Amino acid sequence: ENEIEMRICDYLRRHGRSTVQDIFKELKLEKSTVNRHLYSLQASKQVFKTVEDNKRPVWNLVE
Amino acid sequence: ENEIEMRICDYLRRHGRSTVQDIFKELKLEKSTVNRHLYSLQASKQVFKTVEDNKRPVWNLVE
Amino acid sequence: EIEMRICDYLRRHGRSTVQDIFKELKLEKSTVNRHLYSLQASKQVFKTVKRPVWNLV
Amino acid sequence: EIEMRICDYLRRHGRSTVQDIFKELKLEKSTVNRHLYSLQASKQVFKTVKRPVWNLV
DNA sequence: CGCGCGCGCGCG
DNA sequence: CGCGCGCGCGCG
Incomplete structure (x- = not known):
């Protein structure tokens, strides 16, 4: 859903990394639902991630 | 939700293993949501799983 | 054992x-891939890319 | 390297x-656990149970 | 189409 | 409280 992606980006816009x-936990969505859209949004260059070895990826808006 | 668990058990009752x-895929729920309740239902002895090494667990109702 | 058979296929046929x-080993794709990636971690095999192509060392 | 330090702690202190x-190695719990479970797979260490307790061989 | 994935995990 | 987990994976 576009709505989910909107909420994810709005969260990132408000909170940053x-x-x-x-x-x-904040959006009250499943982790998998959020990851699906994070990686989708990464592909369309709307978000980006940094990953330290063996650590959870950290995400932020490209803008 | 109890409703989710009801639907999972109803699926198993209808389809078996x-x-x-x-x-x-049938219930139109996230895999994680379903697994959460499967493992919860396993704990309360309502469902059971069999696992061949390196394969997806197969689930069915205890009844 | 499976890893032995995989490395042996590679040792004989190359890339x-x-x-x-x-297809040759009569094994599941997922099984072969699970072992290739473990062998990759072991520095025993490597891939070129996808459709990855695998080979020894 | 981390695995070396873990096995060394075990070699000296036992269970x-x-x-x-x-706490001793100044490392993340998740880091130590990731390596212990890999060493378990390697048959280098084993656990008793949870609060698992670990030791060599 | 890359896929190795099992995974439930929320955990401080 | 066991937790190692990264995981997005839907894939035929």
Whole structure:
């Protein structure tokens, strides 16, 4: 859903750098639902992630 | 939700042995939501699983 | 054991897709891939890319 | 390297919880556990149970 | 189409 | 409280 993606981006716009944990717990969505859209949004260059070895990816808006 | 668990058990009652795949695709729920309740239902002895090494667990009602 | 058979296929045929390997060895694609990625971690095999192509060392 | 330090702690102190290990080694619990379970798979260490307790061989 | 994935995990 | 988990994976 576009609505889910809107809410994910709005969360990132409000909070900045975040793991899937911060996002899904706040939005009250499944972790998997959020990750699906995070990786989808990464593909369309709307979000980006940084990953330290063996750590949860950290996400933020490209803008 | 109890409703989710009801639907999972009803699926199993109708179809018998199933992986999380069969269930979540039919119920239109996230795989994680279904697995959460499967493992919860396993704990309360309402469902059981069999697992061949390196394969998806197969689930069925205890009854 | 499975890893032995995989490395042996590679040792004989060289560059191979997972498809080449599982077809010959009569094994599940997922099984062969699980072992290839573990062998990759072991620095025993490597892939080129997808349709990855695998080979020894 | 981390696995070296873990096995060395075990070699010196014997039966240890992940808590014992990470506190001494100054490492994340998740890091130590990831390596213990890999060493378990390697048949290098084993656990008794939870609060698992770990030791060599 | 890359896929190795089992995973439930929320955990502080 | 066991937790190692990263995981997005839907894939045929």
